[PDB]
Amino acid sequence: TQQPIVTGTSVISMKYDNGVIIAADNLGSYGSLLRFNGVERLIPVGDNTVVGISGDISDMQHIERLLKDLVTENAYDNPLADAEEALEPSYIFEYLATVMYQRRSKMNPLWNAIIVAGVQSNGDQFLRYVNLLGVTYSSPTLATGFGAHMANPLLRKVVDRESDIPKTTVQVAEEAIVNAMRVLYYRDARSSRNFSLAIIDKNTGLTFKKNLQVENMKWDFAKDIKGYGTQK
């Protein structure tokens, strides 16, 4: 029975009208020590999905290899596979849902919180959760780990329910994920300034933006705090 040794914390995601955003800090925290820098959570799979993986970096690597063999699996025995039996986010999710459970049943849990975000080739927004209790649910907005408690309410203003999707656009959604990051940077210890942010659209395709920096920086209110409660 594995325990987390090194862990990623927080992937945030949301739905918008023509596709989805998935984003996460880049960090492999070895507990209290911020051990590893430049660790990349977001792995493109096929070209219409990004799967983000938080939790044990040790389990992550293993999941990365399984994901790469799923792409390779689709090529094998197919005359083509870029629109014939092209790899959808949903197929990937189902392949993962089964293995996390199977492993849970053998009592060696893949210790992860996973969000699969993508778009289908049917025009359908896909965004769904799986984790190491093998629990699954579909929801319009998702977040894992610390970020569930913290950042997910904030996105829930932007989209509460599934009839405010057509009234939210790509510039606005992008804006909301970055303000969500700012907040994870401030108020979470295993969150770095470094972050990656991927936009999968069914029209624009994959945009993977790497090494963005938190901005809109508030620290200039800090000189007016003097003492702990009573101190002149």
């Binding site: 290899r65 790469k68 063999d69 390779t72 090529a75 094998y76 025995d77 005359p79 083509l80």
Partner: protein, 245 residues
């Protein structure tokens, strides 16, 4: 030849041959022409896929199959036996990928295939394989092309042939070396691959064939394997039609 020694792929004749192993090459002859062309920056695979009647769905039947994504295989001989070997090739690649975190080198790939075929000429309750596999690709060691015989035997080749049209094929292949000591760069080798299958077909001038060309090219696919499809293929068809007449 004589009586005995035939029946089981483990019995030797006096001559130092084993008739069953010999019988396995004979079986590939009846199969449909395959060629490989090695190049300084690619490999080209071409195959003659016979169409029995005009009922067949065109471009929807292949003997070219992929291993990992950088290795081409194409077989001649018995079709389903050939599938089995390629299945196993995927298994070989996949296992290497897990351990070492990298795509198979071509000499690594040749070794493990060559053993699997050899095992199935080693026992009494097994059967000898009935397929040849011209195969290869491009890797971190450059381009390589191999041709695997039904015995469990292989060697490297600059240009390789097996199947019904293999005498027309080897003859041309040799010609290719004399005219081109530089061995032909990958683009012109597509068009050229076409002309060899068109020639090989003057011993297969019975029924129609479908020309399928694939490649794996360092310069022009980025070391990955992909089929040649669309207008590239057409150009290769038109050149071959011209120069045969």
């Amino acid at each position: 030849i004589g009586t005995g020694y035939d029946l089981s792929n483990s019995v030797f004749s006096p001559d130092g041959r084993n008739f069953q192993v010999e019988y396995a090459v004979k079986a590939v002859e009846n199969g449909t022409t395959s060629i490989g062309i090695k190049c300084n920056d690619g490999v080209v695979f071409a195959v003659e896929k016979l169409i029995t009647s005009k009922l067949l769905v065109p471009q929807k039947n292949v003997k070219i199959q992929v291993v990992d994504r950088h290795i081409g295989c194409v077989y001649s001989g018995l079709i389903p036996d050939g599938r089995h070997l390629v299945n196993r090739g995927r298994e070989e690649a996949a296992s290497f990928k897990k351990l070492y975190k990298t795509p198979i080198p071509i000499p690594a790939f040749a070794d493990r295939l060559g053993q699997y075929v050899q095992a199935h000429t080693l026992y009494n309750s097994v059967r000898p394989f009935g397929v040849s596999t011209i195969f290869g690709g491009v890797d971190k060691n450059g381009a390589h092309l191999y041709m695997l015989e039904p015995s469990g035997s292989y060697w490297g080749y600059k240009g390789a042939a097996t199947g019904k049209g293999r005498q027309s094929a080897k003859a041309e292949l040799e010609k290719l070396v004399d005219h081109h000591p530089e061995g032909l760069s990958a683009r012109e080798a597509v068009k050229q691959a076409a002309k060899i299958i068109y020639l090989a077909h003057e011993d297969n001038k019975e029924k129609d064939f479908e020309l399928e060309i694939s490649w794996c090219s360092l310069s022009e696919t980025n070391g990955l394997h992909k089929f040649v499809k669309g207008d590239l293929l057409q150009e290769a068809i038109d050149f071959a039609q011209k120069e045969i007449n």
